[PDB]
Amino acid sequence: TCPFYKKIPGTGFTVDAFQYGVVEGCTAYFLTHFHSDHYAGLSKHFTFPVYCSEITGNLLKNKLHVQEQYIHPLPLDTECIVNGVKVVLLDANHCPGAVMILFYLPNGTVILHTGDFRADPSMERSLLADQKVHMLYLDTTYCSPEYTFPSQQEVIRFAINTAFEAVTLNPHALVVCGTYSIGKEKVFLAIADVLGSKVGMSQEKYKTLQCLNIPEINSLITTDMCSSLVHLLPMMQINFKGLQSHLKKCGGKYNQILAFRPTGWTHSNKFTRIADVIPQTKGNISIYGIPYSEHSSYLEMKRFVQWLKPQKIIPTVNVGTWKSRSTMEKYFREWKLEAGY
Numbered sequence: 001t002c003p004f005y006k007k008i009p010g011t012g013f014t015v016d017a018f019q020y021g022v023v024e025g026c027t028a029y030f031l032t033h034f035h036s037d038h039y040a041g042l043s044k045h046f047t048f049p050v051y052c053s054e055i056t057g058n059l060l061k062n063k064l065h066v067q068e069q070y071i072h073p074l075p076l077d078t079e080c081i082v083n084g085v086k087v088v089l090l091d092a093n094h095c096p097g098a099v100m101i102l103f104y105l106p107n108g109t110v111i112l113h114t115g116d117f118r119a120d121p122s123m124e125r126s127l128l129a130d131q132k133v134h135m136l137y138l139d140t141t142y143c144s145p146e147y148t149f150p151s152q153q154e155v156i157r158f159a160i161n162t163a164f165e166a167v168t169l170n171p172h173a174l175v176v177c178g179t180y181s182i183g184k185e186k187v188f189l190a191i192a193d194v195l196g197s198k199v200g201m202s203q204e205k206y207k208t209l210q211c212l213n214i215p216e217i218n219s220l221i222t223t224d225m226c227s228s229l230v231h232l233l234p235m236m237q238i239n240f241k242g243l244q245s246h247l248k249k250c251g252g253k254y255n256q257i258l259a260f261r262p263t264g265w266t267h268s269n270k271f272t273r274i275a276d277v278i279p280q281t282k283g284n285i286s287i288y289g290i291p292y293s294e295h296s297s298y299l300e301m302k303r304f305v306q307w308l309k310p311q312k313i314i315p316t317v318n319v320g321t322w323k324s325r326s327t328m329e330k331y332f333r334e335w336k337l338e339a340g341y
């Protein structure tokens with residue numbers, strides 16, 4: 001059965017609620033982004049209205065075969081009316097096509113659901129600036145002060161400089177980047193751009209990327225692995241055995257692999273700076289775990305909420321244990337007392 005934190009009071013609406021069958025009283029199902037923990041349940045047999053971004057709608061139609069007549073894409077930053085309720089989709093700074101949803105309830109209550117997000121000061125100047133928000137359904141993935149990580153820009157600077165140095169020293173090195181879902185496309189695209197190469201990948205991954213409206217993508221990606229010196233592989237193959245095996249398949253074109261695993265957070269963060277990151281190496285294979293996050297750090301999340309000043313916060317992540325829930329509630333109270341709301 002559907003949990004309370006996926007239900008929007010006073011409406012017929014749910015958010016990211018496709019794995020519970022037919023939800024009692026739901027007349028429209030919203031989907032924030034195309035990640036499997038959120039879309040789980042959708043298919044060609046789904047016949048209720050789904051509201052989502054244009055990019056998410058392209059992925060529903062092509063990857064899951066949801067029928068067109070049931071996909072309702074909405075433009076961003078635009079006031080829209082859904083079953084008599086005003087809604088706005090905002091960029092969530094997560095993966096491609098990911099949104100936050102603003103609901104303006106008939107009684108005057110305003111609700112923000114962040115979906116999954118990486119808070120940024122640029123959000124303090126969207127349509128959020130223009131009215132009060134009473135309830136916040138908040139992506140609390142990293143809601144503890146030990147979660148610090150660098151900016152996306154600093155992480156991409158590290159990766160480009162590392163890859164460019166390695167291939168310049170050895171023109172026969174192959175670069176490999178792991179992936180298992182959409183998101184973090186800048187990692188592999190920036191490395192290919194500095195090296196003068198396309199990114200080579202499976203036909204299934206190329207199809208997924210072509211759904212994303214990324215400008216000049218036919219320019220950066222390919223299914224011809226032989227013409228590419230940056231390859232994308234499933235995340236599970238980013239280990240010494242997986243990579244040794246891949247190198248065998250390349251026919252003696254390459255004699256070294258440099259591989260990247262974009263993780264979220266890893267406890268090496270509390271003690272080490274990005275500049276200081278080192279790989280794991282075995283033979284002619286090196287593997288770098290880089291802290292590229294598409295979720296808010298603690299400080300980014302705290303800044304957003306202290307700016308928005310919501311009357312009530314509803315966490316959507318880490319809600320399954322009493323200790324996690326109590327920890328989160330204690331930080332929300334600090335934030336409110338420090339800021340004065």
Ligand code: NI
Pocket residue numbers: 033035094116
């Ligand atoms: Ni996500």
